[PDB]
């Protein structure tokens, strides 16, 4: 008896589940007894409204009832659902971005920027070509065999790996790029271009030599820094200023979605009361710091003969002791600094 059950129990359960869901949907209809009609309501995308009309026209043709079967679209103040139409590529990024929270109806979807920004922040933090290459191979083992792991049971951890396969692919690729800029393949550095640093002509074994700037390395960190005992100083300066700069840029790019949302929702009051002053504050402090970092890189202090400013100390003095600029970065820096302070305060 149980074996007879097994050959058909699954189909019975599918049919009964569908029928129960059908009645649970019908409950949400207003049963007008005088008109003998279920007045149902539902959210459907407008581009799919025609599909709905066509398919109901097909079923009514099947039944031959010739009933009105009124698809009466109507205006409403109710908040519509947030539908994001995602491919296999952007599905993982959409899932990770909306796991925090589901976006307000027809506001900017964070998942579309996330597709690039999430893997590439991961890469900036990860930043190795050997490990990025390993991650790329791991992801490709899921993307190339995509049709085989699909329509296949995956458990949970392997299912998590598969659903994120394009996330992991972009992590691996951007990590290879980042490790190229970090000039890291595992522990070791690449030597594919002529170094911008040239060591002295001759030295004694064990002598604490110092390199000289014959130029600048084209793309990536110079391999002359590998194995140097002051590699950490330059690497920390580089990566810390990179973190500050790229974090500011990412924050500004995301913050401009506030402006785009206010424009789309016709909320000029949010533009003037929230977007403009918040933008002025954010720029006049941290974007000032950002353009200041890039300017300090843009100035050849040893050639100019001017003292290289203490940039973090200057940022601190911008608030804890305004006006007393320690080392002049650029002319009239005191006036601009106090103006930015006053603007941020205002």
């Amino acid at each position: 008896e149980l074996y007879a059950i097994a050959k058909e129990l699954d189909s019975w359960f599918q049919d009964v589940t569908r029928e129960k869901a059908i009645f649970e949907i019908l409950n949400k209809s207003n049963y007008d007894t005088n008109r003998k009609i279920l007045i149902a309501e539902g959210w459907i995308p407008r581009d799919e409204l025609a599909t709905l009309q066509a398919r109901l026209g097909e079923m009514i043709a099947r039944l031959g009832i010739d009933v009105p079967s009124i698809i009466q679209v109507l205006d409403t103040n109710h908040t519509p659902p947030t539908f994001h139409r995602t491919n296999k590529f952007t599905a993982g990024f959409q899932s990770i971005c909306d796991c925090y929270g589901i976006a307000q109806y027809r506001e900017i979807n964070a998942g579309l920027p996330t597709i690039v920004t999430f893997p590439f922040m991961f890469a900036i933090m990860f930043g190795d070509m050997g490990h990025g290459f390993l991650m790329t191979l791991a992801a490709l083992s899921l993307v190339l065999n995509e049709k085989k792991i699909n329509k296949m049971k995956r458990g949970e951890i392997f299912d998590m790996a598969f659903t994120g396969r394009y996330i992991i692919l972009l992590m691996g690729v951007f990590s290879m790029y980042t490790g190229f800029l970090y000039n890291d393949i595992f522990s070791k550095t690449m030597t594919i271009f002529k170094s911008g640093w040239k060591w002295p002509d001759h030295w004694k074994k064990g002598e604490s030599i110092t390199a000289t700037s014959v130029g600048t390395y084209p793309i990536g960190l110079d391999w002359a820094w590998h194995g140097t005992e002051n590699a950490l100083l330059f690497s920390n300066s580089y990566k810390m200023k990179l973190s500050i700069l790229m974090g500011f840029i990412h924050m500004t790019y995301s913050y401009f979605f506030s402006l785009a949302n206010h424009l789309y929702f016709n909320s000029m009051i949010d533009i003037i009361g929230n977007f403009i002053p918040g933008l002025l504050f954010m720029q006049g402090i941290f974007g000032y710091l950002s353009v200041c970092i890039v300017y300090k890189w843009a100035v050849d202090w040893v050639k100019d003969g001017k003292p290289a400013p203490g940039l973090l100390n200057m940022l601190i003095n911008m608030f804890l002791s305004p006006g007393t600029i320690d080392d002049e970065l650029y002319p009239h820096q005191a006036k601009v600094q106090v103006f930015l302070l006053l603007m941020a305060l205002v």
Binding site: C99, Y100, G101, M240, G310, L312, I316, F319, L320
Partner: protein
Amino acid sequence: KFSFSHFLYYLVLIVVIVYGLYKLFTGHGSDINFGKFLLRTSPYMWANLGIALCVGLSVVGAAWGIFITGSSMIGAGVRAPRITTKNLISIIFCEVVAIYGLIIAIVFSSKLTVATAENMYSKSNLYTGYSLFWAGITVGASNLICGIAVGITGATAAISDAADSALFVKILVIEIFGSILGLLGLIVGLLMAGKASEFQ
């Protein structure tokens, strides 16, 4: 009433009192010369203890608040997993506490330089050693306090949000006050070390 820790506390108190009275009565009170201890002791012990305790106590406070509020929000999240992303701002403000310590440790590490033996124990080197020591302690201890406070407040916020989402909002203001406390600690540490020169 007995406990080993209190027994050692009273024992060392008695030993210190007896030693002080012995030195004082014999006319050798100046042998206990904490000032000369401060003068003779290497400034780098003070500076690196300041940095290490800054980051260590900032991390202790951050972690302490983090597991308080994280355990509370995971427990409250069993019925309402929605609580996680909503109240995660508590974990965020606990972590920012340790980031403050990291920033102060970077700033103070900028001061660490090899001072010359002829200039080892000068006024400036002693001043900067004491400055980094006490500024690191100030930032680290304020961060420990603020991390614990923010963790307690965020745990309460997570549980209240589990009770009702409307109660969350006004507890976030309390978390903001807790974060302002740590920010003030950081800026006061910066002011204490602001005029401290490098080791020279």
